[PDB]
């Protein structure tokens, strides 16, 4: 999914 929280870090 997103390794970050807005795209995928």
Q: Which residues contact 1 (CB under 8 A, 6 or more apart)?
A: 8
**Cβ(3)–Cβ(9) below 8 Å:** yes
**Cβ(1)–Cβ(8) below 8 Å:** yes
Tokens 């999914």 belong to residue: 1
Give the span between the Cα atoms of 4 and 7, in whole angstroms.
6
Alpha carbon 4 to its chain's center:
3
Q: Which residues contact 2 (CB under 8 A, 6 or more apart)?
A: 8, 9
**Cβ(7)–Cβ(1) below 8 Å:** no
Method: NMR
Q: Which residues contact 5 (CB under 8 A, 6 or more apart)?
A: none
Tokens 């807005």 belong to residue: 6
Q: Which residues contact 9 (CB under 8 A, 6 or more apart)?
A: 2, 3
């Amino acid at each position: 999914p997103f390794c970050n929280a807005f795209t995928g870090c």
